[PDB]
Structures are given as C-alpha cells and as structure tokens.
C-alpha cells in the first residue's frame, strides 16, 4: 500500500543514513540527494547490506517486490517496516537485536529466516510461519521451543548455543534433514528417534546440569544421559576418582568439593546422518 506518487530523493525516504546509501548504490545513483520513482523502487528485488551499521530500515515498505534481504551485522532493533513486505522470500537479521519477531506474522511467503546472535529469549511468534523452510536460531538464549512443532516444513534448522533442555517438540519434524543442536543442554535423545530423513546432524558439546545434591564422603548420582534408543549413554571421562557402576556414577569424596562432572561421548546415527553426541554432565555439591 506504500506508494510514493511524487519523485522524492532517497535521503527523505529512508531516514537512516546508512540504509539510504545502501539503496543509493543499489540504484547506481550518484548521491542520497537523487530523486527516485516508485517504478525504480518496485524493480528492487535483492538488497545486500551486511555490516552497514544500518539502525533502521524505515522506507523499505516502498519495495514490495523485495524477496532477498541481507542485514546481518547491523543495529536493527525493529522490524515493523518489514511487517508488510508481501513477497519477502529470504531474510537474514543476524548479529542484531530483533526480538519482536511477531512483526513477521503476515509474511507467508518467507522461506529462509535467520536470527542468530539477536539475544532472543522467546520465539513463539514463529508459529505464524508454518511455511518456513530454513530456520536459524543459533547463538541465542532460547529456552522453550514447543513452537517449532508447527514449522513442519523446515528442511533445515539451527538452534546451536542456546539453553534448549527439552528437544521433544522436534519429534514430528520428519521432513527435516539438516539439524544443528550443538552447545545446548541436551540430556535426552529419545526425542529425535523418528527423523528418518536426516542427512546432517550436530549434537555436540552439551552442557547439562543437575539440581544440587548434599555432598557426602560416598556419593552416587544416577546417569541421566540417554541415547536415541533410550539406552544410558556410557560416561567417557569421569572426574575426581569417579567410576561408572551402571546406572549410577559413584565417587569417593573424602573432603568437600563444590561439584563433580563427567564428559561423555557416544557417536550416533539417525536415519542417514552420522553425528556424535558429546557433552559434560555436572552435579552441584553442598
């Protein structure tokens, strides 16, 4: 619905100096003071503005035919301008601070979205994109993920480096293929038991924790880790004179320590993917 009827300079359209220059270079223009028409704005299909220090994309509404956006490495904190870009296909807003992802609600032509490094806590807004085909929510603070249960089109999916403890929601995503669950708090694995179409997987470097236990001279905490079949993954390297007497890891702790740990390892193969489930379980002491 956004249509400039009169020839207007690019400086006035996009209020942000950075994003204005971007469009300028895109349109082979001489300066931001050059006038532009709505026809010239319509023919803009792909903007490439990674690391442009762009703080706002106000004015993008006048580019209805934009289906490629690259804005990684910016200062973007709002995505209301994008809220009504009809044909937006690919979008990449990494290393920003976009959080009100609800602003994408009516982007039913969006395929590949990327929002890593955005300090995102909640992601529930994504429910309004059952058409998504490539999600990229790595490097964040995501806890719950039950939302993803409905993104049943994603053939790709990041999620590395968050705080995902429960991955069960991913269960029915059988149309998946490239899953990335590194750097999380993945204890269980029975969840992905059905991803019979996987091709690439990364279940690496989990950092699970257990609720604090009262330290004794003789301690025994049950193994929590589980494999894809539900078998107690056998602890690779235990710490502090720790031995694994299935299913309980036992310790001989004369004096008081703050915690014990046991790094594990257990290469798994799901469907057609061959990854290696690795991590470090830790137990508080008092």
């Amino acid at each position: 619905m956004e249509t400039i009827t009169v020839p207007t300079p690019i400086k006035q359209i996009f209020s942000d100096d950075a994003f204005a220059e971007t469009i300028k270079d895109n349109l082979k223009k001489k300066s931001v003071t050059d006038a532009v028409t709505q026809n010239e704005l319509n023919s803009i299909d792909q903007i490439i503005a990674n690391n442009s220090d762009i703080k706002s994309v106000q004015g993008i509404q006048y580019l209805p035919n934009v289906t490629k956006l690259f804005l990684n490495g910016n200062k973007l904190t709002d995505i209301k301008p994008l809220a009504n870009l009809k044909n937006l296909g690919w979008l990449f807003l990494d290393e920003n601070k976009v959080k009100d992802l609800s602003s994408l609600k009516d982007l039913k032509k969006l395929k590949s979205l990327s929002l890593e490094h955005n300090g995102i806590s909640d992601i529930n807004g994504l429910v309004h994109l059952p058409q998504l085909e490539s999600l990229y929510l790595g490097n964040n603070k995501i806890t719950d993920i039950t939302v993803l249960s409905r993104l049943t089109k994603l053939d790709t999916l990041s999620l590395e480096d968050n705080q995902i403890s429960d991955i069960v929601p991913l269960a029915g995503l059988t149309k998946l293929q490239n899953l990335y669950l590194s750097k999380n708090h993945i204890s269980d694995l029975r969840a992905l038991a059905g991803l019979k179409n996987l091709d690439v997987l990364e279940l690496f470097s989990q950092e699970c924790l257990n609720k604090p236990i009262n330290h004794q001279s003789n301690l025994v905490v049950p193994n929590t880790v589980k494999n894809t079949d539900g078998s107690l993954v056998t602890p690779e390297i235990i710490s502090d004179d720790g031995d694994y007497e299935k299913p309980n890891v036992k310790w001989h702790l004369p004096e008081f320590t703050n915690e014990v740990s046991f790094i594990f390892y257990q290469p798994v193969t799901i469907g057609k993917a061959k990854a290696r489930f690795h991590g470090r379980v830790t137990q508080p002491l008092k």
């Binding site: 792909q46 490439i48 990674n50 690391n51 490629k68 690259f70 990684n72 490495g73 690919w90 990449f92 395929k111 590949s112 990327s114 085909e133 490539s134 990229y136 053939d155 790709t156 990041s158 293929q177 490239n178 990335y180 590194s182 091709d199 690439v200 690496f204 470097s205 690779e236 390297i237 710490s239 004179d241 740990s261 790094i263 390892y265 290469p267 057609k272 290696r276 690795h278 470090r280």
Partner: protein
C-alpha cells in the same frame, strides 16, 4: 620456499641444543644452525667395519650436567655409544666402552639394538640414567628394556640389579618381537609406547603403554597396558606420538587441565592379522593423569615369566604385570584421515586452539586444528617430497610465539613455522577467512593478503560472495529431477573459524532447489532439480546467478533401421534432442543431443516393440521396431 636442509643420507634422529640442530643420519651426525638451517660442522661416523656395515644412527642425547657433550649411538659395533665433548662455545670425540671383567655374560655398553630402539635421558639422582627399549630377534647381551646409569668417569655404563632390565625369553626371542615406537617421562614415571602381539602367538597385533617408577636403577612398578584407538573400529598399530599440554578448548572436551600432560598418538588400523599398517589412520589423546588411573584400577606377563606359571601397591622382586582391560579413546578427527596414512605428530598451543601438525606416507604436511567438534580442514596442506614424513620432530618455542617444527622426509629436514605460511598461500576467499584468529588475513578483491596490506577498500574478514564457474548438466528434462554439480568458490558461512553449508541455498529459477549437504563441499554443490532459466546461490551474505541451464524437451524424431535380426544385435539409431526396448535394456554406443546409437537386446520374441527413452522422464516410444525372422 622455506628453510630447507638435506644431507648425504637419511636423517634418523634430530635434537636441538642451544641454537644448534643435530641430525643423526646414516654414517653422519650433522650440526646445523638454528637460525637459517645452515650446516656449520659435522662428524663422519661413516660406513664402519664389523665385513662392511652402514652406521644407521639409533639415538641422539645431549647432557650439560657433567660437562657439555653430545652422545651418539651407532648400529655397527653392538650398538655402542660414543661421546662428543663440545669444543667450548660450539672434532674431539671419545667412546663409551669398558670391558666386562665384571662378567662377560653381559654388556652394559652395548646400548642400542639395530632393529629399532628408543633411548631416553634423565639426570635421576646425581647420575645420567639411560632408559633403553630394544627390539630383539634371535641372536647372541642386548636388553629389550633397561635402566643402565652412566658412570662419572664417562666411558661406559653399569646396571645395579639382576632385575634392572626385562628381557623377552629366548623361546619368544624371535617369535613375537616388540617394536618400540616412542617413550617419554611424566609425573615421575617413565613410559614406553610399543606395538606387539595381542598375546603369545596371537595372530593380530596390538599397542600398549608401559610405566615404571625408577630409583637408582629402576623397574619396580613395571607394568604394561593396552591402548586402543577406536571410532565407532580398532586402530591397533601405533604410528607416532607426541606429549604436550592441552589448548584451553581441548581442556573442556577431554577434562584435562591446561598444565597436564597429554599423550597425542596417531594410530593406524593394520592389515589382516599383520602389523603392517594400512593407509587408514586414526588419532586420539590420552590424559597422562587418566592413564595413571587405569593402572590404579585392579594377569601375569607372558614374556618375562613363564606363560604357564602363576605369580605376581602405592609407589610414588618387586615384580612386573600385564593388563586385561584396555584403555581406549575415540578418534578426535572423527576419522577425517580414514583414507590416509599419518606418520608424524607434533602439538602446540596458540591461544585456545590446539593445533597439531601431521605427516603422511606421501610427504603431506598439514597443520590441523585439533578438536572433538569439527575435524577442521588443514589450514596448511602441501607436499614436502615423495618420501613419507618421519615421526621424528622438534617443537621449538620462541618469544611472542613464532615457533617452528623440524620435519624430516628422508634426508630433507625442513624448518616450518607454526604461524602458518602467511596469508599469501591461501587460494580462495572462503579459505582466506578459514585461517585461525591469530593469522589476521583479509581477502582483497582478488588475492589474499595481510590486514593493513589491502590496496583497495575491499578488505574484510566476513563478507565472501558466491561464484558459479560451471554447472553439469547444462540442461534438464521436462519434469525430470536430474542431479546437479555446481562448481565454484565460497559457498560456506563464516564463524567459529569454520565454514559449513548451513546457510547455503540453491534456487533454480523460481523453484527452490534441494541440496544434499553431505555430498556438497565448499566448492562442489550437489543439488537435485525438477524454459531457459537461471540458477541462484545464496551463502547467507549474497547471491550469484548462472543463465545457461535450460529445461529442454527430449524428443525422438525418427528411428532406423526399422526392422532387424529376429535374435537381435543390430545398431539402432535415434534422432532428435537410457534406452531399453521390450523391457530388457539395450545398450548405448554413442550418445549425443542429436543422435543416439544402440545395440538391440537379443530378445526371445518375433513381434514388434516400442522403444523407450528413460532420461529421468520416461519419454517418447517413437516408431516401433520389428523383430522378424528372415
């Protein structure tokens, strides 16, 4: 291109005493200069006379304790050692050899076996002890394992006890030998990594660690234990090993501290029932402290004592023991080197990264960032020469971390820096940012160069755009889902140092394309499709196009000959733009876009059949061919 040096003969051992390299080679012991690999002095041990025999060096050891001196150990005179009293600031050579009036039954000065041996030096308790591992076959004095100390007179050696040495009994003398791969000192204990039988007469081979605390003349806690490198399939034969500290990153994945020793060891799955290694190499690290826990967990040794006799606590006549339960880790490289033979291993730390440079049975040298996570591509990879790299290497640390490993390849020992070969030797843009955090490169429009060395305003460490060189095929069937191979540069995303095809998407015209990521690389993209459209490729930053790909309609104009041999064997020619008639496939002779030649299947029929093209889309059954008896 880099500092090199080659001798008259192959270099067996290398050591470095104060800005001077020492190369114990065949018939020679060269003395190079640390700065430029410049040969300064040398000593000719030469081809000695037993008959005439080559003097293959078997050990180099220097000790400035008494006085500054090198001690070489030949292979001709019962593996005897000789002294080398240094000049003053840099001839003059003695010889270690007394007589055995003590009793001729033994020979403390006959140090090294010519069939492989490793020697360690330590100044334990006022004296210079020598820890010797000898591989022995049937022949008449020469201990397989021995703690002979040196005398203050500096002209011979002397043991201290009946049990200051362990010897493989005569009946097992030649049967199943013990190849000594490497040895080191750690935590007051002495270790030896060896390849051998699994047990007495057992066909396949093994690999074990050996520990014993020594005092005066030790062997008091002697004790073997199996070491198995697996991935999720045993790699028995040990190929080389090196002991350093863990990079801060590696210290999280293996539970080791930053100052604890780590036993990096390149293994190798051996051939069927043999000790001959295949070109299939693994590798894993063994925290020395963790190794010292397996030993502290609770069967008689077959070769020292009698296999059929029965026999055998807390140590910072006292007999020796073996272990039934093998200590084992997993391949750290996930077996990235599954089809290559690794020969050398060296490990240093630059920050958190634990880079370890490797050698190959083909002279391939490479510095790979060690990590459980991803088997990072060697940011340094090339060929020294057709001669396989030697496990013998030196790791030297200088101020502000310059460093260099001395790698040997036959006769040529080259001086390679740890900082990598600069940024100049990087080929593509993606590869220019794949270099570690410390290198500080920056792809500059066309070439890769250092930071402030960018001629134009296109220097960056993130933005790498795609580029399509060529695609195969150039066309496709109407509905068919042909496979696509798209070769180019820069298809991976940047971060954590590594690059993957995560944010890699292919777009054919308007129809989104499906990538099989496993089969795709940073340069080779394999997609499966299904007009005169264009192809698009996004690597998360930008995209490229390629407007040759067409969706032509395969059609068969005419076919000749129209009739043929009842049996069948005539050349059938098709015209137009995976042939099989009557069901049972015929054969293709010459393919084209205009003409096809095929040999008809000798079918057991006498009727006519439709000729079916199956180019991903089963197409025209043009003019029917007729089998008829003449």
């Amino acid at each position: 291109q880099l500092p090199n040096f080659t001798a008259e003969t192959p270099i067996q051992n290398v050591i470095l005493h104060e800005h001077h390299i020492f190369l114990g080679a065949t018939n020679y012991i060269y003395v190079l200069n640390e700065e430029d690999l410049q040969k300064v002095a040398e000593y000719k041990t030469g081809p000695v006379l037993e008959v005439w025999k080559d003097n293959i060096n078997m050990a180099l050891v220097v000790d400035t304790y008494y006085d500054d001196q090198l001690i070489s150990c030949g292979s001709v005179n019962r593996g005897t050692c000789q002294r080398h009293v240094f000049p003053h600031n840099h001839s003059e050579v003695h010889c270690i050899f007394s007589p055995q009036i003590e009793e001729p039954s033994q020979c403390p000065d006959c140090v090294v076996s010519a069939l492989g041996a490793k020697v360690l030096s330590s100044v334990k308790d006022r004296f210079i002890n020598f820890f010797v591992g000898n591989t022995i076959n049937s022949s008449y004095p020469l201990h397989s394992i021995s703690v002979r100390r040196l005398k203050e007179t500096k002209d011979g050696f002397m043991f201290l006890t009946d049990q200051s040495y362990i010897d493989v009994l005569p009946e097992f003398r030649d049967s199943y030998p013990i190849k000594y791969v490497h040895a080191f000192e750690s935590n007051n204990f002495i270790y030896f990594l060896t390849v051998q039988r699994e047990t007495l007469d057992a066909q396949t081979f093994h690999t074990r660690i050996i520990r014993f605390c020594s005092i005066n003349s030790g062997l008091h806690s002697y004790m073997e234990m199996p070491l198995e490198c697996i991935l999720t399939e045993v790699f028995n034969i040990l190929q080389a090993a090196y002991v350093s500290k863990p990079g801060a990153q590696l210290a999280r994945q293996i539970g080791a501290s930053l100052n604890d020793d780590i036993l990096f060891a390149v293994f190798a799955q051996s051939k069927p029932d043999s000790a001959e290694p295949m070109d299939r190499s693994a590798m894993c690290a063994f925290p020395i402290k963790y190794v010292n826990d397996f030993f502290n967990k609770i069967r008689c040794l077959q070769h020292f004592y009698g296999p059929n006799h029965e026999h055998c606590s807390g140590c910072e006549d006292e007999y020796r023991t073996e272990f039934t339960t093998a200590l084992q880790r997993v391949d750290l490289f996930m077996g990235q080197f599954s089809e290559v033979l690794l020969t050398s291993i060296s490990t240093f730390i630059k920050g958190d990264l634990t880079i370890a440079n490797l050698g190959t049975s083909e002279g391939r040298f490479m510095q790979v960032v060690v990590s459980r996570s991803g088997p990072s591509t060697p940011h340094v990879n090339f060929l020294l020469d057709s001669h396989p790299v030697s496990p013998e290497v030196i790791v030297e640390h200088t101020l502000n971390q310059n460093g260099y490993t001395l790698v040997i390849t036959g006769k040529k020992i080259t001086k390679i820096p740890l900082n990598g070969l600069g940024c100049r030797h990087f080929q593509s843009c993606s590869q220019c940012l794949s270099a570690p955090p410390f290198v500080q490169c920056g792809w500059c429009h066309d070439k890769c160069v250092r930071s402030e060395e960018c001629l134009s305003g296109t220097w960056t460490q993130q933005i790498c755009l795609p580029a399509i060189y060529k695609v195969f095929p150039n066309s496709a069937p109407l509905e068919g889902g042909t496979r696509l191979t798209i070769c180019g540069w820069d298809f991976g995303f940047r971060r954590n140092n590594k690059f993957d095809l995560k944010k890699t998407r292919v777009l054919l015209g308007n129809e989104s394309c499906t990538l099989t990521l496993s089969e795709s690389t940073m340069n080779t993209l394999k997609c499966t499709v299904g007009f005169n459209m264009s192809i698009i490729i996004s690597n998360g930053h930008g995209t490229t196009q390629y407007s040759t790909f067409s969706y032509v309609d395969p059609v068969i104009t005419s076919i000749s000959p129209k009739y043929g041999p009842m049996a069948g064997g005539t050349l059938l020619t098709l015209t137009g733009n995976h042939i099989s008639i009557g069901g049972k496939t015929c054969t293709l002779k010459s393919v084209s876009n205009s003409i096809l030649e095929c040999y008809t299947p000798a079918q057991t029929i006498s009727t006519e059949f439709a000729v079916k093209l199956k180019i991903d889309l089963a197409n025209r059954e043009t003019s029917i061919f007729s089998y008829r008896e003449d």
